Structures are given as structure tokens and as C-alpha cells.
């Protein structure tokens, strides 16, 4: 009954006050986390402990991935440690961090953990394909930023870029009025 | 202006190899050694590390070393004599000498050091060896070097060396590096056409010892270029001045501010300097870059 | 049994298998079970790990659920190779003081024959070391 | 290095913040503070320590040629470590962005606000000496053109002292003392510029519309393009006093001018100035872009009037992607499956009434859709 009053467009607590385009995005996202159909009981309980319940999953995912890593801690990729949570939360429906509270809180968690643990998060490898997914750009601008070298190193499916360099290139050249860091501060 | 088929200058700054020493307590010196990748580290009971080399400033900039066109030869001699009169050698001689007087020629050995000291011994000089005690504390900016008791007397040597047909100006530089216990030292290393790193070495007494090369040292004195578009950090002075962290050329020929495009405008720069209105900062920046490449020397030919 | 890796790095994955073999031997205080790698090639340690004399520990079971696992000669640790690094040469002199330290000198020419260190760490302290293992 | 955060203010500029950190922590000036800050970034192995400037003027990340990504990593490193309580320093900087305006003007971004690049001041920054001696800092609004009066003191800004010398607070401190005469600068009263200054500051100013701050600067850049001159404070407030029927009066006069000067008429031949100069200011959010929201309101009730004059205007495949907000690959796909009815990309093969109704069919969004101007 709470989700039905929440999907209708009214204020339902503890669920967040979001626009109607985003409230359906959380329901599709919650079906991807449990990898099953939608459960009404665990959905309301998950936002009752917001945001520290969502922080508890990301800690358990990076502890699970690091222990089961098949490559050298320096050869770790972004899809090998945060391939499920990050790529499954970019466009739900879009990158407006004012209303996409999943991507807004995941970038809040990864900002205070960039150069902790000897720079574990900031040294994660990325391609040129999955750099355009985060930066919201094209492969022509990526190939231009290796000519003028704003971005520091072409095979598009090659792992030549680090996550801390892509995260700080976004804070330099790719913010917008909706997708920028000033909402989760 | 056309480039001739013969145009070449000699360099006006001549550094040498940097030799490393280990000073033990009770003050006796021993050349530093290394293992074989090669690894070099400070021995255990050591106090500090000496470094010593020499720099000359020897006025080869005034005339070309080789020039088969008498029109282009007279174009140089007007440029150097008008740069000297209108602008002066105070700006370039300050920027070269600050790389000697801090530890710029100590590339990655300044890194993680407690303190380091520089002692100059200029040759046409009376006495009282010029000392620079505790850089990273005392000598931070340009004004910190000027507050030294004798900074004007050493800048005016390099000015006199460039402003005379026989200017000599020899400096004997000696450093004193206080490292942590069993610390890194990073010397220069050889070029192999191929982790697998070989050091450059000489022989002092009967033992191999790492050096920091003569061409490596001259590339640290000539990190002056910041006159290029944006100019975030200084670049080693060269034609189409490159960076080597990123393999890029700032001052590309598409920019129009490389050294070979400024040579074609060298006739234009003579009437700017021979007027009475002070030149714009951008034009002088191209005059500092023009002079710093003639101090660097090189073949300037074509065809 | 032999565990064959099929997903990668065989260096930093065979070193994790020995840490589970390490922590097993202090719960039960047993030292009988040993380790060897049949594919001990020069390029890499290999993708095959076998124990002779562990599969009910939490590490091997969770790694089994994923797509990657399968579940004469002597392999001994050489800690003289740990003394050949220049950080270890300074550890050696501090004991001999506890005396001219300048009387010592470096070897300046050393040859090392196929040390195959597996990187691990300690849990009693927060400190790192290697497994320099030869034949 | 260990520092102390001063009194925080969300309207303080970045160049005014480093002066207050240096004065609180006992440094001599800001030249010394940035040079000691570069020394700290070297000691903790930052990749771009050598590009950190010692000049206060080039500190902002739009100034850096290739150090833009290393500059914001440097700014994020300082706020996490060198302070007793973490400040907000990325929120005060002026970053570049990939957002373009109409037709091709680039843009910059400061926190939760996007500015036009052409309205950024680069020669000399004016100031208000009354705010310098009451608030104790400088605001970011002094770096942008159009903001000519103070929104809280109603006094014009100053660029020159009484002795002919300019006063830049980045090089002459925050006190308000000149360099040549070492005296406080004597001041130099309208209403129409006071309303826009209170409107650009973020407060409600009537009759100007309640817009977010990213959109209020977009109207000022748009108003300079209509008059094809500099910004006029008197005609700007009067234009929104008769909203929306003043903006309706221009569009009628533009279509009467281009008809007199008909099946071959193009969209760029009748509405080439108003339509293409109002798409992205900064974006297509019709809830807040009231110019594009009202222009599509005017062209909806005039599609098949006058024997379908507006609905038969020719368009290319290039300028179809500008309206639909798509790419040339989706346009070439919709001529394969023929949702869109007719390839040369610069060829006039599509009509405006078909592009307008294809947008209502396949290209609406939660922000760019018709449901706001109803
Ligand atoms: Zn004011
Ligand atoms: Zn004055």
C-alpha cells in the first residue's frame, strides 16, 4: 500500500520525494539488485535506513570482489570491482544527480575513498568505451583528448585510463546543471 | 627571411657530469657505489652526500659559429646587440642561475630530503664562497634569492659574460644532501634500443660510481620556457618546445610560435626594439625564447 | 587434489591459496600437508596447484560457485634472496652493530637464479613480505 | 601543512577564499600561500603538482590548459587533509564544461550554476568597497558582465580609483586600499540595473520570471542577441513586464518581414533567427526555458493555418537533429523503417509539421515535452 501510494505521486514515507520518472526507476533498479521479482517488504525497509543501508551493500561488494579477484590488485578493473553497481545505476532514467539518488550517493561514497588504501579506487582501469558512459561524451572527443592530452594514457577496448583520472576529468570538463557534484554535498 | 644552407651556433652554457660522494662521520669522503637492474642506495653509517660539477657561461651567442650568408649574419648581430640594450640580460641570467642555486639539477634526489645546501665557487671572484643554506625553507621564491648578501654580484657575472666578446664566468657548484637512513638515489641511466635499467657511470679512484650526466644537467639549467600559450609549468628550452611526461609539442608549427617561425619574423623584431615605445610582453616573450635557443645552440639549416 | 585455474594472474592467485593453507594450520595446529605446482614453468608458476599429505574452507567453496575453478621435486623458501635487497642489507648491518660500518661494501655484481616469490602479508602485524621459492 | 578554515560563505569566490585562508594562517600574502601549497602537493606525490600556479589570477580550473583534471584533483586533496574541518572549495571554482549555448557559444560552470563563457570578465574585475568592509570577502558575481550594481547596496561598482589607477582585489587584497595613493576609493542611482542585479543574485525580482540561476544568465545572453548589441537594463525589464504578449509581438513582426522579403520557404528562411537562437539556453528544459517553451506554444496554434504555412517549411537532416535532440544515425534509421517520411544530409526533404509531430511521438522527455506550456 505504501509503494502504490508512492508510485501514484503522493508523499509516502520513508520513501524519497522524487519525480514520477525517477520513482519507477528505483523499482526497476530494486529488481536488479535482488535479481528476482519485486518485493514490497524489503523495498520499504531498504529506504528506512537510507543512506547507510545502501552504504552497507557497497562495502560488502568491494570486500566480496577483492577476495575473489582473479587479477593482480594493480590489474583490477572498474568492471571487476564495481561492474554491477556503477553500470547498473548510470541512466535511471538519466544522470540528474539531484533526483537520481543512487548515482548521487555512489559518487558520494567513492569521493571519500579515492586515495585511501594506497589509491585502490583511483587506480581502477577503464576503457575508452566505458569512459564515454561516465563522462557522457562520444568516442570522437575521447580521441581528441588523447591528441591534445587533457586525458592521459588508439584501441577503444584497451584499458589505458584510471578511474581517478576519469572522475577528475568530469569535475573539470564535463559537468552540467544537473549532472554535477554540487547536489550530494 | 630565408634559412641559409649553413647556420649553426655553439652552446653558451657548458655543464659537466655530476659526481656523487658519501661523507662518513669524522669527515672522510668515499665515492658512492651501486649493485647489479641496478640499485643505488646510501650506505648505513653515512652522514650525508656530496654532489659536485661545474658550469661555464662563455658568450658563443654574439656571432654565429657558421653562416654562409652575410645578410643573415648581420641580422643576428643586430638582434643580440638590441636585446642587450633594450631588454637586457637580467631576466635570462636570473632564470638560469636559479636552477643552479636550488636543486633543480638534482632531479629526483631532492625528493624525500631533509635539507640540502648549495655552495658556489665563482672563478673571477675575490672571496667568501656563496652559500645557500637550507633550501625548501629559506630559498622558496625569486625574492628569497635576491635577499642573499651577494646575488647581484653573481647575476652581473652572467650579464658580463654574455655582454662581452670574451666573457668567461666559471662556477664550481657543490651540494650537500641530508637523506633518510638507507635512502634512494636516482642517477641518470643509459639509452638501450629495447626493469632492465642500467646506470651511467665513471671511475673515481678504482671504483665505479653513478653519475648524473652532462647533457642531463644542461637540460635542468634550461627549464625556463613558460612563454608558450597557457604556460602552466616551465619547459626545457628547445625548438618546438616539447614535454616528455606527455609526448606532446607545445609551440607546434601550427601554433606559429616555434623557433623557426620567429626566425622569419626576426627582421620585424629589429624595428620594434629600435623604437622608443616599450615592446609588448608577448613580443618580448618571443625575444626571450629567441635568445634562449641561441644560448642553446644547434644546427639551424634547411635543404 | 589438483585445483586448476580457468578464468589471468597465476602469481597473485596461487599466493591467496597458500594464505588459506596458512590460516588452516593455526586453527588445527597441523603441519603435515604440503604444496607443489606440476606446471612450474620459467615464465610463470602455472595454473595448477596441488596439495599432498582444505576444500571445506570458506574460501574454496565460494570460489567454486563461480565459473573459475576445478578443485621427486622440492619447493622450499629461500630467505637469502630477501637479504639481497638493499633494504635487507641494512637490516643485516644493524644486527652486527647490536664496529666500522664503512668497512663494509656492496657486492656490485650479483646473479640470482629463478627466485619465484609469491607476494603475501602478515596478519599479526600489518607488514608485507614475499615467498621466494625455488626448486 | 595544517591549516584553519575561516568563516565559510557560499557566495565567496575562489580567489577571495585563498586570501582569507592565508590571512588567518599567518602567511604574508596569497603568492606565498600558493607557493607553500605547491610544496605540500609535491610532498604527498600528486601527479600534477608542477602545474599548480603561484598566480592568484590563473588559479581557477578554466585557466589551466591541460591541468584542468589535475587541478580539481589538487583542490579535492587539500580539502580532505590540510584542514581541521573539511571546507567546500570545489563548489567555489569556475570549471569548463561541454555545454554549448545558441548558436555556438561555450559555457562555464560554478557548482550548481552554468554561466555563458562570453560574459566572463577577463580584463579587470570590478568590486564594491562597502561589501569588502562589511562582509569581509568578495562575491563571484563580480566576475561576470551584466552585474553592474550591488544587489544589496544599490551602488555602482568601481574599476578605477580617483588617482586613475585600477583596483583589482586579487592583487591588492580585500581591504579596499589603493596601491598608488594608499587611500580608500571614493564611490562613483538607477532602478532598472538594480532589479537585474537582484535578479541575477538569485532573489525574486518582479516582473522578471522565477527561474533557476542557470537560466537567468541564459536570458541575458539571449537579450544581447536580439538587439544585436550590448545589454540594456531598461528595455530588458520592460520586455518581461508585457510577458508573454511582448514576445508574441516580435515573432509576428519577424514572419511578416521574411514573407515579404511560398512552397519553397525553409525553416532557416522564416524562423532562422528566433528558433535556432533559443534551443539550448542552456538546455531544452521547457519548464525553465520560457523562450523555447513559448515559441513552441505559438507555433502549435499556427501549424495548418494560412493553408499550412508553418507546417510546410523545409528542413535538413542536420537541423532535424537539433530539434529532435538525436543523431544522424537515428535519422538515417528512420528513413530505412520510415517513421519519418522523405541520403544527402544537407538536403531539404522534410517538413516542419512532420518534425514537430515526430517529436511528440518518439522524442519527448521528462523535461523537454509539450506538457509545460499547456
Ligand atoms: Zn556591494
Ligand atoms: Zn588611488
Amino acid at each position: 500500500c505504501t509503494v502504490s501510494n508512492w508510485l501514484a505521486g503522493h508523499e509516502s514515507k520513508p520513501l524519497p520525494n522524487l519525480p514520477k520518472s525517477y520513482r519507477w526507476g528505483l523499482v526497476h533498479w530494486w529488481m536488479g539488485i535482488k535479481d528476482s521479482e519485486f518485493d514490497h517488504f524489503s523495498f520499504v525497509q531498504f529506504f528506512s535506513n537510507w543512506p547507510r543501508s545502501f552504504h552497507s551493500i557497497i562495502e560488502d561488494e568491494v570486500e566480496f570482489n577483492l577476495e575473489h579477484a582473479v587479477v593482480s590488485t594493480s590489474e583490477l578493473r572498474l568492471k571487476d570491482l564495481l561492474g554491477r553497481l556503477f553500470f547498473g545505476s548510470i541512466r535511471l532514467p538519466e544522470r540528474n544527480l539531484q533526483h537520481n539518488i543512487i548515482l548521487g550517493e555512489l559518487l558520494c561514497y567513492l569521493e571519500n575513498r579515492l586515495w585511501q588504501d594506497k589509491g585502490l579506487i583511483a587506480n581502477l582501469k577503464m576503457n575508452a568505451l566505458e569512459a564515454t558512459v561516465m563522462l557522457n561524451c562520444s568516442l570522437d572527443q575521447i580521441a581528441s583528448m588523447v591528441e591534445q592530452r587533457i586525458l592521459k594514457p588508439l584501441d577503444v577496448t584497451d584499458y589505458l585510463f584510471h578511474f581517478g583520472d576519469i572522475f577528475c576529468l568530469w569535475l573539470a570538463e564535463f559537468q552540467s546543471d544537473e549532472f554535477n557534484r554540487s547536489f550530494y554535498v | 627571411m630565408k634559412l641559409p644552407t649553413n647556420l649553426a651556433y655553439e652552446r653558451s652554457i657548458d655543464p659537466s657530469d655530476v659526481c656523487f660522494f658519501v661523507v662518513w662521520p669524522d669527515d672522510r669522503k668515499t665515492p658512492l657505489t651501486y649493485n647489479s637492474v641496478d640499485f643505488c642506495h646510501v650506505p648505513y653509517g653515512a652522514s650525508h652526500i656530496e654532489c659536485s660539477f661545474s658550469v661555464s657561461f662563455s658568450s658563443e651567442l654574439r656571432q654565429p659559429y657558421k653562416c654562409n650568408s652575410s645578410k643573415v649574419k648581420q641580422t643576428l648581430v643586430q638582434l643580440v646587440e638590441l636585446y642587450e640594450t633594450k631588454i637586457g640580460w637580467t631576466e635570462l641570467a636570473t632564470r638560469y642561475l636559479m636552477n643552479i642555486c636550488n636543486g633543480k639539477w638534482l632531479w629526483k634526489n631532492t625528493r624525500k630530503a631533509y635539507c640540502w645546501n648549495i655552495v658556489l665557487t665563482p672563478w673571477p671572484w675575490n672571496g667568501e664562497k656563496v652559500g645557500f643554506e637550507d633550501i625548501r625553507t629559506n630559498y622558496t621564491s625569486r625574492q628569497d634569492f635576491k635577499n642573499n648578501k651577494n646575488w647581484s654580484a653573481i647575476v652581473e657575472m652572467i650579464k658580463t659574460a654574455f655582454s662581452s666578446t670574451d666573457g668567461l664566468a666559471i662556477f664550481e657548484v657543490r651540494a650537500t644532501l641530508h637523506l633518510p637512513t638507507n635512502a634512494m638515489v636516482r642517477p641518470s641511466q643509459v639509452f638501450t634500443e629495447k626493469n632492465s635499467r642500467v646506470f651511467q657511470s665513471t671511475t673515481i679512484d678504482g671504483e665505479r660510481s653513478p653519475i648524473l650526466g652532462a647533457f642531463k644537467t644542461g637540460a635542468a639549467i634550461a627549464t625556463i620556457d613558460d612563454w608558450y600559450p597557457e604556460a602552466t609549468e616551465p619547459l626545457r628550452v628547445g625548438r618546438f618546445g616539447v614535454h616528455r611526461e606527455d609526448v606532446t609539442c607545445y609551440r607546434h608549427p601550427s601554433t606559429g610560435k616555434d623557433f623557426f617561425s620567429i626566425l622569419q619574423q626576426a627582421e620585424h623584431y629589429i624595428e620594434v626594439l629600435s623604437a622608443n615605445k616599450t615592446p609588448a610582453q608577448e613580443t618580448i616573450n618571443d625575444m626571450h625564447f629567441l635568445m634562449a635557443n641561441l644560448i642553446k645552440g644547434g644546427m639551424f639549416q634547411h635543404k | 587434489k589438483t585445483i586448476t585455474f580457468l578464468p589471468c594472474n597465476n602469481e597473485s592467485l596461487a599466493a591467496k591459496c597458500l594464505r588459506v593453507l596458512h590460516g588452516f594450520n593455526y586453527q588445527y595446529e597441523t603441519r603435515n600437508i604440503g604444496v607443489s605446482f606440476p606446471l612450474w614453468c620459467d615464465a610463470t608458476v602455472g595454473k595448477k596447484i596441488s596439495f599432498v599429505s582444505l576444500l571445506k574452507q570458506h574460501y574454496f567453496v565460494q570460489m567454486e560457485q563461480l565459473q573459475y575453478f576445478h578443485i621427486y621435486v622440492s619447493f622450499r623458501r629461500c630467505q637469502s634472496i630477501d637479504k639481497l635487497t638493499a633494504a635487507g642489507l641494512a637490516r643485516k648491518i644493524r644486527r652486527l652493530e647490536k664496529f666500522d660500518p664503512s668497512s663494509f661494501a656492496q657486492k656490485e655484481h650479483t646473479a640470482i637464479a629463478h627466485y619465484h616469490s609469491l607476494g603475501e602479508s602478515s596478519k599479526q602485524t600489518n607488514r608485507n613480505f614475499r615467498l621466494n621459492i625455488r626448486m | 601543512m595544517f591549516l584553519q578554515r575561516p568563516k565559510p560563505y557560499s557566495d565567496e569566490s575562489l580567489e577571495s577564499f585563498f586570501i582569507r585562508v592565508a590571512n588567518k594562517n599567518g602567511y604574508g600574502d596569497v603568492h606565498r600561500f600558493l607557493e607553500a601549497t605547491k610544496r605540500f602537493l609535491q610532498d604527498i606525490d600528486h601527479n600534477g603538482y608542477q602545474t599548480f600556479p603561484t598566480d592568484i589570477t590563473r588559479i581557477n580550473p578554466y585557466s589551466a590548459k591541460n591541468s584542468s583534471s589535475a587541478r580539481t584533483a589538487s583542490f579535492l586533496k587539500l580539502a580532505q587533509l590540510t584542514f581541521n574541518e573539511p571546507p567546500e572549495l570545489l563548489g567555489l571554482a569556475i570549471n569548463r564544461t561541454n555545454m554549448k549555448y545558441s548558436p555556438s557559444t561555450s559555457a562555464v560552470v560554478r557548482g550548481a550554476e552554468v554561466f555563458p563563457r562570453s560574459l566572463l570578465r577577463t580584463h579587470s574585475i570590478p568590486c564594491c568597497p562597502l561589501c569588502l568592509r562589511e562582509n569581509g570577502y568578495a562575491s563571484y558575481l563580480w566576475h561576470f558582465q551584466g552585474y553592474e550594481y550591488c544587489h544589496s547596496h544599490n551602488v555602482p561598482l568601481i574599476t578605477t580609483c580617483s588617482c586613475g589607477k585600477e583596483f583589482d582585489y586579487r592583487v591588492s587584497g580585500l581591504k579596499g586600499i589603493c596601491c598608488k595613493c594608499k587611500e580608500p576609493i571614493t564611490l562613483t542611482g538607477h532602478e532598472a540595473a538594480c532589479t537585474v542585479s537582484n535578479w541575477l543574485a538569485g532573489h525574486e525580482s518582479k516582473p522578471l520570471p522565477n527561474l533557476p540561476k542557470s537560466y537567468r544568465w541564459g536570458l541575458v545572453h539571449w537579450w544581447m542577441g536580439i538587439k544585436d548589441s550590448e545589454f540594456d537594463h531598461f528595455s530588458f525589464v520592460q520586455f518581461f513586464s508585457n510577458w508573454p504578449r511582448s514576445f508574441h509581438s516580435i515573432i509576428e513582426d519577424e514572419v511578416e518581414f521574411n514573407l515579404e522579403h511560398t512552397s519553397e520557404l525553409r525553416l532557416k528562411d522564416l524562423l532562422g533567427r528566433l528558433f535556432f537562437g533559443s534551443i539550448r539556453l542552456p538546455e531544452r528544459n521547457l519548464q525553465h526555458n520560457i523562450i523555447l517553451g513559448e515559441l513552441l506554444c505559438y507555433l502549435e496554434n499556427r501549424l495548418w493555418q494560412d493553408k499550412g504555412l508553418i507546417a510546410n517549411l523545409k528542413m535538413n537532416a542536420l537541423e532535424a537533429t537539433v530539434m529532435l535532440n538525436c543523431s544522424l544515425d537515428q535519422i538515417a534509421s528512420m528513413v530505412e523503417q520510415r517513421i519519418l517520411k522523405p541520403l544527402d544530409v544537407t538536403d531539404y526533404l522534410f517538413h516542419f509539421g512532420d518534425i514537430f509531430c515526430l517529436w511528440l511521438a518518439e522524442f519527448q522527455s521528462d523535461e523537454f515535452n509539450r506538457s509545460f506550456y499547456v
Side-chain angles (χ1 to χ4, degrees), chain D residues 161 163 178 181:
Chain D
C161 181
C163 293
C178 181
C181 66

Side-chain angles (χ1 to χ4, degrees), chain B residues 123-182:
Chain B
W123 175 58
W125 179 260
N126 289 317
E128 295 178 354
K129 292 180 176 65
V130 183
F132 293 94
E133 290 90 5
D134 197 2
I135 311 167
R136 191 182 289 275
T137 302
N138 295 319
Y139 295 97
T140 300
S141 64
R142 175 172 289 172
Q143 189 58 253
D144 289 330
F145 289 104
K146 291 182 182 179
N147 289 321
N148 196 1
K149 182 62 66 68
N150 44 9
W151 180 261
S152 300
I154 284 93
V155 171
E156 287 289 325
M157 284 188 176
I158 306 171
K159 289 170 68 177
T160 308
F162 289 162
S163 297
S164 180
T165 184
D166 187 80
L168 195 268
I170 293 173
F171 292 147
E172 294 284 332
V173 186
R174 180 175 290 168
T176 299
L177 287 169
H178 293 278
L179 270 303
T181 301
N182 193 4

Side-chain angles (χ1 to χ4, degrees), chain A residues 56-149:
Chain A
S56 298
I57 296 172
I58 306 167
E59 293 177 353
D60 293 331
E61 290 292 327
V62 300
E63 288 178 353
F64 172 96
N65 281 157
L66 287 176
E67 335 306 11
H68 313 110
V70 171
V71 283
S72 64
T73 163
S74 98
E75 291 290 327
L76 266 184
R77 300 175 295 173
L78 185 60
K79 68 184 288 185
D80 291 329
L81 183 63
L82 293 173
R84 183 66 182 87
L85 296 175
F86 185 76
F87 287 161
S89 67
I90 298 299
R91 295 177 67 188
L92 294 174
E94 287 293 326
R95 291 177 177 89
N96 192 357
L97 298 176
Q98 187 180 4
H99 304 293
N100 190 0
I101 62 170
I102 301 299
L103 189 64
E105 188 68 25
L106 181 60
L107 293 174
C108 184
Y109 180 76
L110 294 174
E111 185 180 3
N112 296 114
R113 201 182 179 182
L114 287 173
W115 296 278
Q116 291 180 356
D117 196 76
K118 292 177 70 68
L120 180 62
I121 302 299
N123 290 318
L124 293 171
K125 290 183 180 180
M126 292 175 70
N127 298 119
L129 290 171
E130 61 189 2
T132 62
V133 179
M134 184 177 177
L135 292 174
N136 195 1
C137 65
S138 66
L139 294 176
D140 289 330
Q141 292 181 357
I142 296 298
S144 178
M145 291 185 288
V146 185
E147 182 68 28
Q148 61 188 354
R149 290 181 183 178

Side-chain angles (χ1 to χ4, degrees), chain D residues 128-131 142 147 150-153 155 157:
Chain D
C128 181
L130 277 75
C131 295
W142 297 351
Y147 185 79
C150 180
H151 66 279
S152 295
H153 295 91
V155 59
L157 298 176

Side-chain angles (χ1 to χ4, degrees), chain A residues 5-21:
Chain A
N5 201 3
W6 180 60
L7 291 172
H10 296 283
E11 182 177 1
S12 297
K13 293 180 176 66
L15 297 175
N17 290 318
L18 296 178
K20 292 184 183 181
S21 298

Side-chain angles (χ1 to χ4, degrees), chain B residues 54-93:
Chain B
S54 67
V55 174
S56 301
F57 293 93
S58 70
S59 157
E60 324 306 342
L61 169 77
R62 207 145 277 281
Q63 71 276 10
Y65 176 74
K66 187 175 175 69
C67 184
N68 59 357
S69 179
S70 63
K71 297 292 183 182
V72 188
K73 181 178 173 67
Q74 293 179 356
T75 303
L76 175 69
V77 183
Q78 291 180 1
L79 278 175
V80 174
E81 289 177 354
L82 264 295
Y83 182 84
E84 176 182 358
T85 302
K86 187 70 178 69
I87 297 172
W89 295 111
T90 306
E91 182 65 30
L92 285 177

